[PDB]
Amino acid sequence: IGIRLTLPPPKVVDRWNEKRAMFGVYDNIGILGNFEKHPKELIRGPIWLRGWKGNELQRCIRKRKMVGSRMFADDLHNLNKRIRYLYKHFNRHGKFR
Amino acid sequence: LRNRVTDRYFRIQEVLKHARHFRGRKNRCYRLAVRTVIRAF
């Protein structure tokens, strides 16, 4: 019980597919490109996370600020509630003061 | 990334191999065997 009785299908990884072959290209776009573009501009993803880092509380505050007006009702309610829960946790609870 | 223990079977067998010659359920039930095996050691 709890362990498979047959080997799983072999893992086939094409290490020289185009995505892997060209990984990292243009990561020095600024240093080698007269600084016309910052490498952070190559980052693709959520509009509130491109070229920025923060803890979960900071991410939540940032998302509500940047896209809260476009969020679905149920989603925004949960986000507001998450911000409240994290505010109490980080500011009031923990080992250290 | 969700990680789950995949080799728990072998971890259990490390204890139970020492409890095969025990009497009763403590020779097969890990919860019981582990305590008796420690005492044996």
Binding site: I3, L5, L7, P8 | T6, D7, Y9
Partner: peptide, 26 residues
């Protein structure tokens, strides 16, 4: 179904040891 190959491979080796013990080869 759990992810991974190492545990499954290890269990195969044990299943092959037990099979041989049940029927020791000539």
């Amino acid at each position: 179904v759990k992810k991974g190959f190492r545990a499954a491979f290890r269990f195969q080796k044990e299943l092959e040891r037990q099979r041989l013990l049940r029927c020791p080869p000539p």
